[PDB]
Nucleic acid binder design. Sequence first.
DNA 1: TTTGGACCGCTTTGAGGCCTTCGTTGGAAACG
DNA 2: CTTTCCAACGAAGGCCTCAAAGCGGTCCAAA
Lengths: 88, 66, 297, 297
Amino acid sequence: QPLSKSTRDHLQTMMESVIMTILSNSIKEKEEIQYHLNFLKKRLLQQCETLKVPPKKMEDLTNVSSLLNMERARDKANEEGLALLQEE
Amino acid sequence: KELNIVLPEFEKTHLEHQQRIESKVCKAAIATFYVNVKEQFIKMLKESQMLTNLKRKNAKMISDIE
Amino acid sequence: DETVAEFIKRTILKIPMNELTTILKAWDFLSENQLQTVNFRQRKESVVQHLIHLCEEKRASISDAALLDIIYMQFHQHQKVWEVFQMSKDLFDMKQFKNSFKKILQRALKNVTVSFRETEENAVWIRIAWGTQYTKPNQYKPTYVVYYSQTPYAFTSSSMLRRNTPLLGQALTIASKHHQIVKMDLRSRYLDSLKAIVFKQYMDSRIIHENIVEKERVQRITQETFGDYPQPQLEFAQYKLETKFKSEPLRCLIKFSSPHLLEALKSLAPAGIADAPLSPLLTCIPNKRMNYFKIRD
Amino acid sequence: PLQKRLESVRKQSSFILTPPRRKIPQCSQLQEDVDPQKVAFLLHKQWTLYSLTPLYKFSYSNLKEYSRLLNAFIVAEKNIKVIFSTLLGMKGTQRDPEAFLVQIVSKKVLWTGWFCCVFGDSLLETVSEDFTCLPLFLANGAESNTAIIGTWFQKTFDCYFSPLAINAFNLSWMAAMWTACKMDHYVATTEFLWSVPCSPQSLDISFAIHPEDAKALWDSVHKTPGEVTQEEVDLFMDCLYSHFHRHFKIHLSATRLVRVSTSVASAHTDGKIKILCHKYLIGVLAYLTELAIFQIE
DNA sequence: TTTGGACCGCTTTGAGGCCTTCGTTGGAAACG
DNA sequence: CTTTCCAACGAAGGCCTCAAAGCGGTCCAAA
């Protein structure tokens, strides 16, 4: 299975951001380096679109961390309740 | 997962880009870029790892509380 | 809260607009002036939006919404199926009973949405919304339990109670200060008829008819078995039988469905369909206070 | 021509001949041309029966023309499409014409129509070459769509659908017919439904028998192997009535049979058919195919 | 000829049938 | 000994129909 479209768009956004950042500190040789970096970005986009992965669900990159925190809290609450139950 | 496959591709692409480029300042910038993105990618891989670990643990304590 | 707002909206949508005013007269959570600010002749969307505005002007909570749902249930009391629980083995007080029941249900897992509403004839109606250890109790799958003070019987609507039945039973029996609690196999939808049954609170001389003795005997037997009083409105019956053929026992399973039972059964003998004395399996439905039957030879 | 001998044959058709015995269907797997997915969609679904006069100038080639004509009629009546398909392997004989399906798909199928004829040759023996004889129609979907399709067919092919009815005699015969059928997996206990005749809605007796007990009783009252006879059906009904009267002293015989369900299929008087097992499916059609002829003649 | 009244029209809508989905023990199958 | 899934199927939420009544148009009685 090809790469998930959400992952492709996320990766493309990160490549755009990093290319803007690496262009910010470049003063001279702007046009040639930006053309080369654009070619690099498009070849990477083609490679990642063509790339194949086994059918494993992989959720959005940004939100997962937050989920973990909530999940952690859930377990804590569960543990607390468990303790209370055992106490009873 | 998907990242487990795209990171090796990113490593090989970074290697070939570093090999082809000749400017020292551009080499340093590309190296810093690679370090940052590799750190973020391995961080989110770890985050997904404890994500599935926390899912399994949640199921276990669900059975326990039941 | 938006959850209570949409809950109230759904309950209002369940309420027919022809009696919404009565609901307010039974709800009384909102001031009468707020009621006057809303006309009921206008559109349904308009009236529900105005009611949302009124409840948002005040502080919307879960207790008032649950009370509204309870009173809607009271006015309808026809949309759910009821089962009857019996307690067995003398001082009562509303406040401590409520406190004990609330404490037990909070101790159940961690929380539950419990609401009380006293009604005439000592009919305490309790709305219970269940929730697990890691989720807020759901308001879309509620249950209702009706308790009568100092009485050995209680009523329950079983829509999703099959998930955790013993919990409710043990909570009810510990709150009622009663030891043994059992479920009799009696299930029906007309709740008022259940109330009645559980408490036992219910010319052209040229023609020369022949066999008139048979007609007068069958009508007399039917009248003595049933009676002049209107029979309780019961709607479903089912017998599970396993008896020897005598003609390896045959296992039979019958279901009687009728919008008005005990009346077609009352008319079977006059219509000549069944014998003059009906079998005890049909003549003791109000007597034995039994709905599901198992009989063997 | 055909009209004269047709007059003679329906003149000979009088209620004087004895009802012929019927051969019990045997376990028959689905035919090679029969697509398992198509029948699986057909089976485990509810169908309404319709009797049809033979089609006038019906061709199986111009199916797309029929589909577009129905679509045009529907849009004239008013995101939906009409699909015509040809289904192989469910004709009783080579004389019986090919069967086909019509579907309404919302661009999720909502309305399905099946035209078929199995072992139906008497109509085919009294018809000219121009006509196509598929007097059996099965409908599944909204009644409005069925009425629209019927109107189109009436305008086009000069025919009507008549709602086929099943009496108590035929329903008891078919009940005995499928209880004679051998089912490896008893996945549905047999069940009969009755209705007492009364202007107000009254009790509706439902009587269920365990499949093992039913099969044992059948084999007890089974005399001719591989064949069902009127005496077998009558003794089956008599045994059931005697059992019911021994249980309850109620003469079930004075009640109208309205629905009969068994492990393989279920039938209702109004014209409802439910099919579960493919092994006898084809034979099922043949039997009900005779009823269409009996309604045409 | 003008104005009010009552007819029939129309749309709105409330309730029942019904299909489908949710929940599901209970048994079967794989197994730390 | 334990866990998860298919099954048996029960059940209730939701789709879909129509019978009900209020609002609106129109004809006819009255000024």
